[PDB]
């Protein structure tokens, strides 16, 4: 019941500069704001988002996270001459003050709060606020590291007070530790702060021992502060994704936050003179996408850092692209996280295991198409469509004469072909769903016709306790199976998850979806995902999240096959393919027989598929 994305921006926040010479601050230039908006204008993204005017944050809204003494100190900056602002900023670490900075800082704060109102009032689905100056380094009574007021800390307290929110998730993917956010919510379990950052064993700015993975939280908030220190530069995409799959996403879904706030700093990308990482801008399209099912999509992205004018624009658009639901780009070259990242991931998982038990270890135009059974017609949203051709029927006649029958299953396969060509050609449609008939002839005609589309690699997800419908050996097809009978997994190109029926089914499926299925599928880089569900539910609770997270692969091109018409599950499949917001799962403990089965599958697979590794490999 909510649509669109908010883009909050104003040219006035680019009207304060660094005046004196300061090599530490020279990277923070007003051009960062102009290049980011102009890149959104060039790619047709800014014009596609609901623009929201910028307001000033009131004095009381700023006092939510700051003290009157420090606010009054900043309040007297616009009356200072260059000699006086140089002295006022020498009182702090790596920050400069301008005659207009107090004005724009209140705009950066107000713009953020206005983004929370837009998202929480269901006026838009998600949003981004291109603001300046940043926020995550400022604290109750100090301006630190380019930041005057903590914009994201305002948003969380603001949403806590004005919307009675009990659980808020802050994600800070800047390369600098947002200590101002951690300080403010240190003893606070209502706001889960996660932050990866360049650390290099405290040798990197801001050189804090609190930035380390040891800092977990004080008092009743312990376990809701998660630091992931990068100790080596050049972190690649596989390092960032492994952090999500094995640290951030398992804790987030367990948290089940009512609002996701993102400290989007893009100095964590390739070419940045401060972060010196090697992550492509395209990785951010997936970072945001992996967080969409949380808080039913209610995600407020707020700009933080990013200082390579060319690298900054590209990642801002990748973020807005996935915010609007555009297809995420395929990412290749993924594999094992580097040994330093595996060490840091291993340490933080351990220290946090006492608070999140999932980390324990044993001691050592139209987007979707719907073809339902003939005659029926359902209420499908503004991204969907129904069905055939004689060019495809000539094909279908060839498959019957060669490999197989007479029935209207030929129409099911004839429609499977028509959408498959519509997905891989024309970009006519993206994903698709086919309520289907006989399973074996349907999957065989679907896959074999998909590999000749061509589809370099095809990922197949099948939920049901059936027999293997197609084989997997030639290295071009990977298969995931959900079932009830243990298949005694033999081949590496497969992954069979045997679950025990119960109330712990959905909680275990999510642990296997984030810890196993997603890391394998991302390293696989498929050209098409083929989902099939047997008519033999617990899937209804979780299938929505599965269909949305897996769309990060294959540029979204997913074909789903449902046997036996289930109106509730068919409507759930189409809604998640259409890009609609996904209902939360609520707060979350899998059976010990389940996690024993998955780590058994991980050890069995983590050698070929390195993205499964969450520990540094024990060298022989
Ligand atoms: N070559 C590394 C020198 C360290 N300089 C620290 C500058 C503070 C930047 C703060 C920032 O990025 C806000 S997100
Ligand atoms: K950070
Ligand atoms: K916290
Ligand atoms: Zn930064």
mmCIF file of N, CA, C and O and ligand atoms in Angstrom, residues 168 181-182 184-194 216-218 221-226, ligand 3:
data_model
loop_
_atom_site.group_PDB
_atom_site.id
_atom_site.type_symbol
_atom_site.label_atom_id
_atom_site.label_comp_id
_atom_site.label_asym_id
_atom_site.label_seq_id
_atom_site.Cartn_x
_atom_site.Cartn_y
_atom_site.Cartn_z
ATOM 1 N N UNK A 168 15.187 -0.600 15.840
ATOM 2 C CA UNK A 168 15.692 0.097 14.666
ATOM 3 C C UNK A 168 17.083 -0.441 14.353
ATOM 4 O O UNK A 168 17.900 -0.635 15.259
ATOM 5 N N UNK A 181 27.615 7.407 16.579
ATOM 6 C CA UNK A 181 26.412 6.588 16.654
ATOM 7 C C UNK A 181 26.548 5.548 17.754
ATOM 8 O O UNK A 181 25.617 5.330 18.539
ATOM 9 N N UNK A 182 27.710 4.888 17.825
ATOM 10 C CA UNK A 182 27.924 3.874 18.852
ATOM 11 C C UNK A 182 27.845 4.476 20.250
ATOM 12 O O UNK A 182 27.213 3.901 21.145
ATOM 13 N N UNK A 184 26.151 7.063 21.256
ATOM 14 C CA UNK A 184 24.800 7.499 21.594
ATOM 15 C C UNK A 184 23.890 6.321 21.918
ATOM 16 O O UNK A 184 23.031 6.421 22.801
ATOM 17 N N UNK A 185 24.065 5.200 21.225
ATOM 18 C CA UNK A 185 23.257 4.006 21.439
ATOM 19 C C UNK A 185 24.049 2.879 22.106
ATOM 20 O O UNK A 185 23.747 1.699 21.908
ATOM 21 N N UNK A 186 25.066 3.227 22.897
ATOM 22 C CA UNK A 186 25.935 2.211 23.488
ATOM 23 C C UNK A 186 25.156 1.311 24.438
ATOM 24 O O UNK A 186 25.099 0.092 24.253
ATOM 25 N N UNK A 187 24.539 1.903 25.459
ATOM 26 C CA UNK A 187 23.732 1.179 26.430
ATOM 27 C C UNK A 187 22.280 1.022 25.990
ATOM 28 O O UNK A 187 21.405 0.810 26.837
ATOM 29 N N UNK A 188 22.011 1.112 24.693
ATOM 30 C CA UNK A 188 20.646 1.144 24.167
ATOM 31 C C UNK A 188 20.391 -0.086 23.313
ATOM 32 O O UNK A 188 20.982 -0.212 22.223
ATOM 33 N N UNK A 189 19.536 -1.014 23.749
ATOM 34 C CA UNK A 189 19.228 -2.191 22.930
ATOM 35 C C UNK A 189 18.138 -1.962 21.894
ATOM 36 O O UNK A 189 17.855 -2.874 21.107
ATOM 37 N N UNK A 190 17.520 -0.779 21.868
ATOM 38 C CA UNK A 190 16.460 -0.501 20.905
ATOM 39 C C UNK A 190 16.989 -0.238 19.500
ATOM 40 O O UNK A 190 16.247 -0.418 18.527
ATOM 41 N N UNK A 191 18.244 0.179 19.370
ATOM 42 C CA UNK A 191 18.832 0.540 18.087
ATOM 43 C C UNK A 191 20.057 -0.338 17.869
ATOM 44 O O UNK A 191 21.053 -0.214 18.593
ATOM 45 N N UNK A 192 19.994 -1.215 16.869
ATOM 46 C CA UNK A 192 21.103 -2.103 16.541
ATOM 47 C C UNK A 192 22.025 -1.393 15.559
ATOM 48 O O UNK A 192 21.674 -1.209 14.390
ATOM 49 N N UNK A 193 23.213 -1.018 16.029
ATOM 50 C CA UNK A 193 24.228 -0.374 15.207
ATOM 51 C C UNK A 193 25.227 -1.415 14.710
ATOM 52 O O UNK A 193 25.883 -2.085 15.515
ATOM 53 N N UNK A 194 25.337 -1.547 13.390
ATOM 54 C CA UNK A 194 26.366 -2.345 12.741
ATOM 55 C C UNK A 194 27.268 -1.420 11.941
ATOM 56 O O UNK A 194 26.798 -0.452 11.337
ATOM 57 N N UNK A 216 30.926 -4.333 22.164
ATOM 58 C CA UNK A 216 29.712 -5.089 21.897
ATOM 59 C C UNK A 216 28.523 -4.294 22.417
ATOM 60 O O UNK A 216 27.395 -4.449 21.936
ATOM 61 N N UNK A 217 28.770 -3.430 23.388
ATOM 62 C CA UNK A 217 27.720 -2.659 24.028
ATOM 63 C C UNK A 217 27.838 -2.733 25.536
ATOM 64 O O UNK A 217 28.294 -3.726 26.106
ATOM 65 N N UNK A 218 27.432 -1.659 26.199
ATOM 66 C CA UNK A 218 27.451 -1.582 27.649
ATOM 67 C C UNK A 218 26.040 -1.783 28.189
ATOM 68 O O UNK A 218 25.052 -1.553 27.488
ATOM 69 N N UNK A 221 22.232 -2.738 26.629
ATOM 70 C CA UNK A 221 22.381 -2.720 25.190
ATOM 71 C C UNK A 221 23.457 -3.630 24.642
ATOM 72 O O UNK A 221 23.702 -3.621 23.430
ATOM 73 N N UNK A 222 24.103 -4.423 25.497
ATOM 74 C CA UNK A 222 25.192 -5.286 25.056
ATOM 75 C C UNK A 222 24.685 -6.346 24.081
ATOM 76 O O UNK A 222 23.709 -7.056 24.356
ATOM 77 N N UNK A 223 25.363 -6.456 22.941
ATOM 78 C CA UNK A 223 24.952 -7.336 21.867
ATOM 79 C C UNK A 223 24.287 -6.623 20.714
ATOM 80 O O UNK A 223 24.027 -7.253 19.679
ATOM 81 N N UNK A 224 24.002 -5.329 20.856
ATOM 82 C CA UNK A 224 23.377 -4.557 19.796
ATOM 83 C C UNK A 224 24.339 -3.564 19.163
ATOM 84 O O UNK A 224 23.912 -2.720 18.363
ATOM 85 N N UNK A 225 25.626 -3.652 19.499
ATOM 86 C CA UNK A 225 26.685 -2.919 18.814
ATOM 87 C C UNK A 225 27.624 -3.935 18.184
ATOM 88 O O UNK A 225 28.195 -4.773 18.890
ATOM 89 N N UNK A 226 27.783 -3.864 16.865
ATOM 90 C CA UNK A 226 28.576 -4.832 16.111
ATOM 91 C C UNK A 226 29.585 -4.070 15.259
ATOM 92 O O UNK A 226 29.201 -3.374 14.312
HETATM 93 K K1 LIG B 3 23.317 -0.476 20.276
#
